[model samples]
Target: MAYDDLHEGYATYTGSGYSGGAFLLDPIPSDMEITAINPADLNYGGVKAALAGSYLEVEGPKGKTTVYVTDLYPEGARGALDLSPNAFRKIGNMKDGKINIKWRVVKAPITGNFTYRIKEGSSRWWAAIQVRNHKYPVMKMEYEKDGKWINMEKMDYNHFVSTNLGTGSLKVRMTDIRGKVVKDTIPKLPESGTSKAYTVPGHVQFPE
Candidate 1:
């Protein structure tokens, strides 16, 4: 799956040509005439961080392969772990700013799969959603503050919503392939300091 909502100015093909268990490299030009694909800054988050680089590996009925994740540094409470070049290449290729493929955790499986709610009880604005059905992962919700938003670069799962003045909340749900769905909600409240202050770090822990 791909994120159609990406607003990044551009995307590039960072994948090298692969054939017969080998990759082909283009000739390095001494001139600036040769252009390389520009890549978006990438990183890892929470559970994903635990498996950065060659530390993570995946095996399935089809085959097995070791995977490297990108480094997603902490941005306040929320953070973003990135996908590696090998990881990116395996999944077709980059289209917009996002990889047009499916990915999952192999080495560091998530635990305590759960969801939460964030309410700015000052404004009528509310954000309700669920992070359910996965091998295991975390969920978060961020919103605009003053004039700026988190990251100021990419559109993650948790980003700016809107502002009002009353009863803000985040609603979460969990489920399995059997179509079983579990629900959870966070405290409905709003406190002020800075946008980064309200961010949640490893708040949602998935199950092993």
Candidate 2:
């Protein structure tokens, strides 16, 4: 199996230098399950590919905690999981600052529609789009312009961007790593903030 190797190590917090930004924001949950992968692993982009929105079922010596990949660890720290402070506390001692654990990705069920966050300073000409709260890892995000579909570049942090989109109701087509594609038209996107749910048709599982 591609994910058979058990990368065991510490689970830390979402630091300020996160490349992909934090998954869950303020009013953080005590048992929040957010995490960051090592930059080395992220560089390979193999097992780490298509893993941004997926859940990691981590089993530690004390207990197990399911965490979401939210950021990247320092370049030198391969095989380490930097977890949310609250998440780290769930399976290990905070004072320890480290823990031994095993982890693997699992397809978490989705309950609601996917969401889009329009980056600040986006306008009718150029816009940055972020896909959030999806059950699968989005491989591609494309927006339509003048009756044609234009591909958006996937940023290292996972945001999709395009230029000259021109303030129309944006039509976004998202393709998952598994080749499952879902498309929807958002009547209008909010500038500098998040918008309503973009409903996906159905659920698709990742192959074993």
Candidate 3:
């Protein structure tokens, strides 16, 4: 049974500098599961598998795009995971015409430092305590895996968007999400190419 829906918010913060706070996002309701019309399962085109009971669909400035949702996980009844958090991915399959699907729960530690500048008496909580100090509070994640760090895998954040907290502390402790970084004392990240046209390489290209 699903827990009673309560106020839910997604934000990362610690009690310092910026007086970090959490902002709630409304539940996405149009995200419901729809059946695939069995369109021949073409090997060239992308196929999707997702949570069965989801009502969510992808939307953007263009409009709503209908994504295929298929259920492959049948072990939910005996387990405690909801498994209904829908996601879309396109894995290449060889046996199924060059496609293979696999997921592993690995210990991946995501450690990043956040530095925010806040004026005195900015944070509500800090103000409530009559604290008028303005200093960057370094908040760290405190989740330990079984002899490992619980790193977030198969995340879309790193793929589609590039967010930088600051130029201070940012690196993967163990695993490299983007393979290996070429170590060079270049003093800055290498420029992509002669032009910005090569923005996203080996991935989707923004139409001209």
What TM-score do all the candidates reach, one by one?
Answer: 0.30, 0.72, 0.15
- For 1-208, candidate 1 gives per-residue lDDT tens digits of 2211222221123332221111011222222111111122222332211121212332222333343322222231211223334443443343444432222334333344342323222223423222322342222233334443321111232222344423444343433222244444445444442232232222443343
Task: Give the deviation of candidate 3 from the true structure as CA RMSD.
Answer: 19.8
Better of 2 and 3 by TM-score: 2
Score residue 177 of candidate 3 by CA lDDT: 16
lDDT of 3 at 202: 18
Give the lDDT ranking, best first.
2, 1, 3
Cα deviation at 113, candidate 3, in Å, is 26
- Write down the lDDT of every candidate, Cα atoms only: 0.29, 0.62, 0.19
Best-fitting candidate, scored by TM-score: 2
Cα lDDT of model 2 by residue, 75-145, tens digit: 63756787776667778787776777788765554466676666665655666666776666676777887
Candidate achieving the largest lDDT: 2
Q: Could you give the C-alpha RMSD of every candidate to the true structure, in order shown?
A: 15.1, 5.1, 19.8
Candidate no. 2 TM-score: 0.72
After superposition, candidate 3 runs with Cα above 4 Å error: 1-162, 168-170, 174-208
